[PDB]
Amino acid sequence: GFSQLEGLRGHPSVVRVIGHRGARGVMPENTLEGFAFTLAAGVRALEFDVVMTADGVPVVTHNHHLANAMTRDGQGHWLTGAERQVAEMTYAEIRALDVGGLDGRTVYGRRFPDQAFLTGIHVPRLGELLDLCAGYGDQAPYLLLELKSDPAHDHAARAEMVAAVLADVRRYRMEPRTVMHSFDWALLGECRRQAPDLPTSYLSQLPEGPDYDRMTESLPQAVASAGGQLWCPYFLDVTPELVAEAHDLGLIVLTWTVNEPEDIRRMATTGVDGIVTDYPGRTQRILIDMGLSWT
């Protein structure tokens, strides 16, 4: 089947640990430095986000607009004013910016007060991250590659994005580690069209994507029927019964983004295959305490 799933499939005593944006709680998110830390912490699977620049470069960042809370200019000053769209910026323009730390006077910055504060850190190209990962050979981590389609609907552009992402995955020969992951289920269908050998992972989050109000099948049922290999529900949306239903349909379930100790502990007991977390060490330690492992 899909050998990429071997790093994400759980067992009775095994719950996988996936580093969210690398390890946002410890290092600046979606940075090569953060990803290197995460792998050095023994984490075997990484989640990260891919968006496209104006000049067709896949880059690793979560927001479609560069957030003032996260971004400094070449002078070292936090950006102010309009948050600029990644889609309207060339790579070169993005590269001049610094995403090495957070502004501790902002609500977002105050969420992650223990994160290191680095300077002169660039938004990476997807190719840079893949090249890094490929160098580790058989120890390359599993990649939950979150595709973020430009919300400003053009199928041509969406197909171009998927094609650009795949060109990088293939260039670095990361097919055996790569999972295409998204809230955009139509985009996942396009992933499957251009890359039938890469598994697809379906993100879900209940309100308060599918029409959560009108749908008559369960989320796991909908994912299986769409052709997905993974169902990734927000952790407040998980029950042991829903996990069991997904497993009966042959799906792998990874939940996110679980950071509080009581929430990690609770999720580990539900049977989820793995936990996406901003705090991989914290998660490792809770799993060990419960007699579980992640390798």
Partner residues linked to 46 by β-bridges = 19, 143
Q: Is 289 in the site for a copy of itself (CB under 8 A)?
A: yes
Which token pair is 42? Answer: 């023994």
Position among 14, 41, 54, 87 found at the interface with a copy of itself (CB under 8 A): 41
Nearest-approach distance from CB 54 to Cl ion, in angstroms: 25
Position among 21, 125, 192, 282 found at the interface with a copy of itself (CB under 8 A): 282
Which residue numbers come right before each break in the chain (C to N over 2.5 Å)?
152, 208
Task: Give just the sign of the alpha carbon dihedral 240, 282, 255, 108.
Answer: positive
Residue closer to Cl ion, measured from CB, 14 or 244: 14
Complete DSSP assignment for 28-57: -TT-HHHHHHHHHTT--EEEEEEEE-TTS-
Complete DSSP assignment for 76-116: SPBP-SSPPBGGGS-HHHHHTSB-S---TTSHHHHH-TTS-
From residue 115 to residue 154, what is the string marking binding to a copy of itself with x (rule CB under 8 A)? xxxxx-----------------------------------
Q: Is 75 in the site for a copy of itself (CB under 8 A)?
A: no
Q: Which residues contact 277 (CB under 8 A, 6 or more apart)?
A: 17, 18, 19, 20, 25, 256, 257, 258, 259, 264, 283
Cα 149 from Cα 64, distance rounded (Å): 9
Nearest-approach distance from CB 173 to Cl ion, in angstroms: 10
In the annotated binding site, the residues are 47, 49, 77, 146
**10 Å Cβ neighbour count for 240?**
11
Q: Is 7 in the site for Cl ion (CB under 5 A)?
A: yes
Residue closer to a copy of itself, measured from CB, 177 or 282: 282
From residue 2 to residue 31, what is the string marking binding to a copy of itself with x (rule CB under 8 A)? ------------------------xx----
Residue closer to Cl ion, measured from CB, 83 or 175: 175
Cα 194 from Cα 86, distance rounded (Å): 24
Residue closer to a copy of itself, measured from CB, 40 or 156: 40
What letter does residue 13 receive in the DSSP assignment? T
Nearest-approach distance from CB 285 to a copy of itself, in angstroms: 5
Options 11-19, 72-80, 88-96, 285-293: segment touching Mg ion (CB under 5 A): 72-80
Position among 55, 88, 160, 197 found at the interface with Cl ion (CB under 5 A): 197
Q: Kindly give the interhelix angle for 155-171 and 185-194, rounded to the nearest 10 degrees.
A: 50
In the annotated binding site for Mg(2+), the residues are 47, 49, 77, 146
Question: Residues interacting with a copy of itself, by CB under 8 A?
Answer: 26-27, 33, 36-37, 40-42, 101-102, 104-105, 109, 113-119, 261, 279-282, 284-286, 288-289
Question: Residues interacting with Cl ion, by CB under 5 A?
Answer: 7, 44, 106-107, 175, 195, 197, 295
